[PDB]
Amino acid sequence: TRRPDNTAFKQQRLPAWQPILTAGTVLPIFFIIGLIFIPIGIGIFVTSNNIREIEIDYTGTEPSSPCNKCLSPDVTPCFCTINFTLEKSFEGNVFMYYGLSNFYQNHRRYVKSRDDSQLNGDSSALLNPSKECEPYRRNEDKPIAPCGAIANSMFNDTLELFLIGNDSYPIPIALKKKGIAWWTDKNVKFRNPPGGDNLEERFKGTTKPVNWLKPVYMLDSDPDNNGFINEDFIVWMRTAALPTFRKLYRLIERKSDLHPTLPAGRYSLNVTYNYPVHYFDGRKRMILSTISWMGGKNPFLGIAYIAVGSISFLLGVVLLVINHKYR
Amino acid sequence: QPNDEVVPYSDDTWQVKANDRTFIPMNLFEQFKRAANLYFLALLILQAVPQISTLAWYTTLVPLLVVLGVTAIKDLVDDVARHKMDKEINNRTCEVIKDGRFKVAKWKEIQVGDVIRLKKNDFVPADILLLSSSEPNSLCYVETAELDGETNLKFKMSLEITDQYLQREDTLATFDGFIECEEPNNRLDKFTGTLFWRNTSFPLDADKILLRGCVIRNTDFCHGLVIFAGADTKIMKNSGKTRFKRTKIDYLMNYMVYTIFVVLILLSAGLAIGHAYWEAQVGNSSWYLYDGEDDTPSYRGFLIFWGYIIVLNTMVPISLYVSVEVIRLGQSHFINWDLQMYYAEKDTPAKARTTTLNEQLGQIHYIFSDKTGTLTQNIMTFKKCCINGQIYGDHRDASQHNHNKIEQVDFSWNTYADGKLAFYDHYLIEQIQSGKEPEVRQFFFLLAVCHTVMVDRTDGQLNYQAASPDEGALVNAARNFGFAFLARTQNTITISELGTERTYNVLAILDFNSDRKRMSIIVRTPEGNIKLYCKGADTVIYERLHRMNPTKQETQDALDIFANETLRTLCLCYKEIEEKEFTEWNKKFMAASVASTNRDEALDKVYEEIEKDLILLGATAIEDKLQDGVPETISKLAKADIKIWVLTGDKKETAENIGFACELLTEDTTICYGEDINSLLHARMENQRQESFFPPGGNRALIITGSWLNEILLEKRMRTQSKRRLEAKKEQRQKNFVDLACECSAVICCRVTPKQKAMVVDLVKRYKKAITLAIGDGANDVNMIKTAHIGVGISGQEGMQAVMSSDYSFAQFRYLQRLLLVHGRWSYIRMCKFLRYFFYKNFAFTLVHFWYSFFNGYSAQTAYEDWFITLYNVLYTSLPVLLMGLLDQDVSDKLSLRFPGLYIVGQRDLLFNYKRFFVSLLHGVLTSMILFFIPLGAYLQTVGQDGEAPSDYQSFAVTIASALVITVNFQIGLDTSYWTFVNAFSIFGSIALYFGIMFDFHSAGIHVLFPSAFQFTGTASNALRQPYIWLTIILTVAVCLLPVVAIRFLSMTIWPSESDKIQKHRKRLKAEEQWQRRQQVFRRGVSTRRSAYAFSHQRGYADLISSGRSIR
Ligand SMILES: *[C@@H]1O[C@H](CO)[C@@H](O[C@@H]2O[C@H](CO)[C@@H](O[C@@H]3O[C@H](CO)[C@@H](O)[C@H](O)[C@@H]3O)[C@H](O)[C@H]2NC(C)=O)[C@H](O)[C@H]1NC(C)=O
Ligand SMILES: CC(C)CCC[C@@H](C)[C@H]1CC[C@H]2[C@@H]3CC=C4C[C@@H](OC(=O)CCC(=O)O)CC[C@]4(C)[C@H]3CC[C@]12C
Ligand SMILES: CC(C)CCC[C@@H](C)[C@H]1CC[C@H]2[C@@H]3CC=C4C[C@@H](OC(=O)CCC(=O)O)CC[C@]4(C)[C@H]3CC[C@]12C
Ligand SMILES: CC(C)CCC[C@@H](C)[C@H]1CC[C@H]2[C@@H]3CC=C4C[C@@H](OC(=O)CCC(=O)O)CC[C@]4(C)[C@H]3CC[C@]12C
Ligand SMILES: CC(C)CCC[C@@H](C)[C@H]1CC[C@H]2[C@@H]3CC=C4C[C@@H](OC(=O)CCC(=O)O)CC[C@]4(C)[C@H]3CC[C@]12C
Ligand SMILES: *[C@@H]1O[C@H](CO)[C@@H](O)[C@H](O)[C@H]1NC(C)=O
Ligand SMILES: *[C@@H]1O[C@H](CO)[C@@H](O)[C@H](O)[C@H]1NC(C)=O
Ligand code: BEF
Ligand SMILES: [Mg+2]
Helix, strand or coil: CCCCCCCCCCCCCCCCCCCCHHHHHHHHHHHHHHHHHHHHHHHHHHHHCCCCCEEEEEECCCCCCCCHHHHCCCCCCCEEEEEEEEECCCCCCCEEEEEEEEEEEEEHHHHHHCCCHHHHHHHHHHHCCHHHHCCCECCCCCEEEECCHHHHHCEEEEEEEEEECCCCCEEEEECEECCCCCCCHHHHHCCCCCCCCCHHHCCCEEECCCCCCCCEEEEEEEECCCCCCCCHHHHCCCCCCCCCCCEEEECCCCCCCCCCCCCCCEEEEEEEEEEECCCCEEEEEEEEEECCCCCHHHHHHHHEEEEEEEEHHHHHHHHHHHHHCCC | CCCCCCCCCCCCCCCCCCCCCHHHHHHHHHHHCCCCHHHHHHHHHHHHHHCCCCCCHHHHHHHHHHHHHHHHHHHHHHHHHHHHHHHHHHHCCCEECCCCCCEEEEECCCCCCEEEEEEEECCCCEEEEEEEEEEHHCCCEEECCCCCCCCCEEEECHHHHHCCCCHHHHHHHHHCCCCCCCCHHHHHCCCCCCEEEECEEEEEEEHHHCCCCCCECCCCCCEEECCCCCHCCCCCCCCCCCCCCCCCHHHHHHHHHHHHHCCCCCCCCHHHHHHHHEEEEEEHCCCCCCCCCCCCCCHHHHHHHHHHHHHHHHHCCCHHHHHHHHHHHHHHHHHHEEEEEEEEECCCEECCCCCCCCHHHHHHHEEEECCCCEEEEEEEEEEEEEEECCEECCCEEECCCCCCCCCCCCCCCCCCCCCCCCCHHHHHHHHHHHHCCCHHHHHHHHHCCCCCCCCCCCCCEEECCCCHCCCHHHHHHHHHHCEEEEECCCCEEEECCCCECEEEEEEEEEECCCCCCCCEEEEECCCCCCCEEECCHHHHCCCCCCCCCCCCCHHHHHHHHHHCCCCEEEEEEEEECHHHHHHHHHHHHHHHCCCCCHHHHHHHHHHHCCCCCCEEEEEEEEEEEEEHHHHHHHHHHCCCCCCEEEEECCCCCHHHHHHHHCCCCCCCCEHHHCCHHHHHHHHHHHHHHHCCCCCCCCCCEEEEEEEHHHHCCCCCCHHHHHHHHHHHHHHHHHHHHHHHHHCCCCCEEECHHHHHHHHHHHHHHHHHHEEEEECCCCCCCCHHHHHHEEEEECCCCCCCCCCCCCEEECCCCHHHHHHHHHHHHHHHHHHHHHHHHHHHHHHHHHHHHHHHHHCCCCCCCCCCCCCCHHHHHHCCCCHHHHHHHCCCCCHHHHHHCCCCHHHHHHHCCCCCCHHHHHHHHHHHHHHCCCCCEEEEEHCCCCCCCCCCCCCEEHHHHCCCCHHHHHHHHHHHHHCCCCHHHHHHHHHHHHHHHHHHHHHHHHHHHHHHCCCCCCCCCCCHHHHHHHHHHHHHHHHHHHHHHHHHHHHHHHHHCCCCCHHHHHHHHHHHHHCCCCCCCCCCCHHHHCCHHHHHHEEEEEEEEHEEEEECCCCC
């Protein structure tokens, strides 16, 4: 038994601040929030309105469309063609996406059907894949190189664009198939199996996924864009978050000439229908969009910011009135 | 029938021969008792199964191991502290005969049947059969202020056989005697037995047995034989059974956890039917969701019921109990370190020896307090007097009053005087010195003659050994005023009057007993005159006054004033006896002094016969000192709506006097004794054979003796019917008494045994559903310290009986101001804030999975990273709430003692009901709703759609996690009202730690080491650099936080609480008038309105002195 130490902490006296929510301390934050949210909402809405985007739905589910014949494709190669128009020419880089609707890529039974060890370029995992991708682990007697339900359910559809010029002869449009995936994904997350120089001998003793028409070898002729580093494969493997999603497909680079990248006029879409989604009321779309210097076309954020700013201002006014009436 | 002078022990063979004598159980206890740990282990077992697992095995262990480690560490620290307290408070020793001669030995090395020796002021270790003592006839005086609240000294005597043969250790060592006595029991007044020695049998009696709580005084040494020991002692059998104490909030928390269990079960079942239907409709058509398992939709729903249970397990907290325990430990250590609760004189800091009963200090409804040693210092002094109708003792100088600021009279003129008596009155000194008024000296001569104290002059210092505090005080006052009682013998007294030593000749001593209420003495002066001097209660002396007494009215006024000042009053008288009358009365007295068959009644009648015509002298006032700041504490705790009851084992006069001196009772209060309460209860029972017993506007108090308490509570086959009807009647009577008692301003219980104190506390607890506190010292207060919700022991003294079983132990009654109005109130507020925020932030984190279920086929897919779920409850939202629960204050302590009315906030369960729980749950539900649905709306459209487009599952997860963390760590800041630097540091550092750890997990190196564990590689770097993501996060945080601010401001502005009002005007508060005693209540109309008589003494000492037993 002795005298306790006299210290700020022990004696329950530590230097501190006492923030009483005085009526002159809460109204300012309401008004500041309103005045800073309204202009941001206006700017975002204005930027979103000034973006030219065209979405073409080519699922062919409803009749009287020039792709319904591919809902019962007796012959494997089924070709459709969609005619559309661009009233106002685009400018700058243009992005081409393929989008799927009512496609649950966030299902738990589907998200886990993956082997990140095999996709990392591991000799031990290349054979004897992980047990998580059990339904598509081995085909008959050999491992499946991209095991899992994620790899098998991969977009099997080729899309091409043509411009109807004044000569009545379709003009092809070059589409870049590189630089459409995260740098880390292509350079760190995904890598080919180690050893050798020819991809043929690298995947020795491993078959193709049961659904893939051709093995991992012939995904691309370039030796820097085939294997597990294929960008059309990386883009798909990055599972979406909601039933409806858009995955980047191609980049159309702005021509060095002053002419628009996609001059206004008439265009034809050449789609090789191979991916079936009509069984479960899914839909397939092709989206052409232009680049923004603030993100992209997001009207929701602008409208929400406008509404929240207005509500904050109104709340500030009402709270001021109540404070005056009960002062 | 009921007696007001005896405690009712009744209404509540042993053979003795002389000299013929660490981690596994804590883990098991926490697992079994705490259902949460078993629940988490079951979740682990479920996660083991692969067919149902939806989360990795890391999730439930990584936090659970931390919980186990923290709990084990706290348990080890508590065990160490308890073992310390026990070791460093159990240091007591005594002399024992275990070898050829006496040896020192601790109280634990005592065996029934081993002789021992005790010294002055040495607590008795166990029940003893007194065998010998240094005093003549082997007498021994014992103070039992802790066995019962009696401040006078009792006397014990031993057998004549053991007195004349066991005077030396030589015979004690060879002592060999048999004893056969009753088995151990809880009856402290009687003891029946027999001692066989020297081939002869001798009966025993209570007057030969010293109990454990007794303290030996006025006796150099005392040799005895241990009869009982350990828990068999008569005072240890009066200790109730220790019980496990749980706060009122613990049961609320248990009901809360059960409700969360039910809610989780319902949500899991609903989502299970949802998934079953989805699989039936859309699951089979989806050709990409093929798993090769032939499971029907119903089987899938049943299987995923457990998956959703696992996913939503986090709804029930995993770190709730560790946080609560740390909070309570910190608050208890704050109580220990308190410097205002530190008694410098005895050097006794406060102590919180139980670290689990903290918030309950903020919910007290009743306090039950001992009187002797708790509300008093066991010190009383002679304050004022009245002589010939003149009141002496008030401040004065010289012979006429001049000013209040007067010095202290010097007693240099006296020879025996010392500094014990502090008297500020000069007129008395001049009156005595001059001698112009002989009755002034006669007054003090009476004070120095009528006593029955003893005098010891071993060192020539003239020490006074008094068996009654009142007699000691009066004799000291007389000695300081020149009349010193020097020596006594069988037939003489040798008082020295103003330096002249006159040896009188005592002729008779007329003894004191509770019924007689007075003492007297007949003595012959040296000249030859015979005079009788008496002193006693005013009531019994004003019926025997001679016809002629001019000073009667003036002395009556003086007595009224003394009673008004809360002092113990006695009246003094004398008379002259003629030779013939004296000889006749002496013949009759000697006739009545030999008849031992009915000696008491004959002596009483002889005493009555002589005290007929008495001449008054005046009155004396003795103040019984209270502990400093007792009335102030009582008034403050009364302003906080806390009712103080006094449960004392002391006589009725002392209890009433202290009640008046503590301001508990006043002139307005009407006092009801046992008989009035019994009559009221009988009338109410007859009426019933609700309405208030008294009019609401009145003021009343209760003074109930122990015997009357038993009488009014009825505590003084067809058999089953009789038992049930009797029990029902007893229950009705107890409820009626409780209702009547709780309707009155104050209640005082006197002459009550420890079992009765426990009975009253239990009755209040049961029939009023009130939180009770018990404060006291000694051994008789242990039972009510173990029965009440909170028990406090007054430490600092040599008696450490009540402190052993207490919960909190400080040294003075005053500190109760800070235990309740600062520590308890703050603890309650902090615990309520902690619980509210904790449930809010735990519910706001798990409902995101429920909301997401609608957009993933109800497939139990987590919306967070596999490792965020692990560390959320440990790293990101753990420190700030603990810090707010340890360092939060609404108003300063100096401003919380000044406004006791704040206490009621915790007294009615307002800060956390069972309704605030559902409000917090709704808040969490809305917060999760916003946190999920704003990012969802942002992600449906474009979100930075280019080559580096974070619009996938992982970007969604990191966005929601960031918004959640920011929102929660800003809500915690909104809650806090005491923004210490550490509070802000933790609030702003939890988020920084989250970001750092996230960027660490989303790193190339850790992925390279092992990629299976981490799948979110590179998501943070490529997802938090987009302006749209940050705008989404800011919008979510703003939407989550603005309505809370608006609602808080509106509630404060329209319905402000007491703390709000105090804080708003805190700057202008300067008026603080210290509590002052109500100076004057003098009135006219009644000659006497209360008899303030009070005397503490026991019959028998006059018998000892008249004979040679007490003379050495
Ligand atoms: C991918 O492209 C292919 C064709 O370009 C289509 O998917 C799958 O194509 C294979 C044939 O290459 C179909 O094989 C099936 O094999 C079993 C026996 O191995 C047989 O019993 C079946 O009747 C069928 O022949 C496979 O069914 C087919 N997947 C379907 C129809 O869902 C499709 O265009 C694209 N699909 C995917 C998932 O990438
Ligand atoms: C700040 C606190 C006190 C109020 C928080 C309420 C807001 C979260 C609510 C109020 C108005 C709501 C908005 C009302 C209207 C819309 C338009 C709606 O968009 C449409 O469907 C219309 C078509 C189009 O997007 O162009 C998207 C939801 C949104 C932004 C709502 C988002 C949520 C808002 C901002
Ligand atoms: C106990 C109280 C607190 C309710 C809490 C649980 C609810 C969230 C559960 C109970 C019943 C469940 C519903 C049971 C059945 C269905 C059918 C289910 O199947 C479909 O209609 C969608 C399939 C399709 O889109 O074709 C959709 C979810 C739903 C409404 C469930 C949604 C979640 C509900 C409302
Ligand atoms: C707090 C007050 C002011 C607003 C209370 C309104 C809520 C009850 C509303 C607001 C958002 C609504 C939710 C908006 C979206 C959905 C998804 C909806 O399911 C679908 O639309 C189909 C899912 C699929 O595509 O499979 C089920 C109802 C639910 C949960 C709604 C439940 C009712 C909610 C929570
Ligand atoms: C003041 C606060 C405490 C009250 C609660 C506010 C809610 C009513 C707000 C918060 C989030 C809002 C949701 C935010 C996002 C959406 C998605 C939005 O859908 C779309 O943007 C796409 C519409 C389409 O293309 O079909 C529909 C409104 C909704 C459900 C909003 C409904 C209103 C919500 C639930
Ligand atoms: C598009 O227009 C050309 C013009 O000749 C026509 O041949 C072709 O069939 C059209 N394709 C459609 C409508 O899908
Ligand atoms: C592109 O469309 C034209 C339309 O005539 C035709 O060559 C074919 O359908 C498509 N190309 C290929 C290679 O099939
Ligand atoms: F110490 Be109490 F007066 F029993
Ligand atoms: Mg006591």
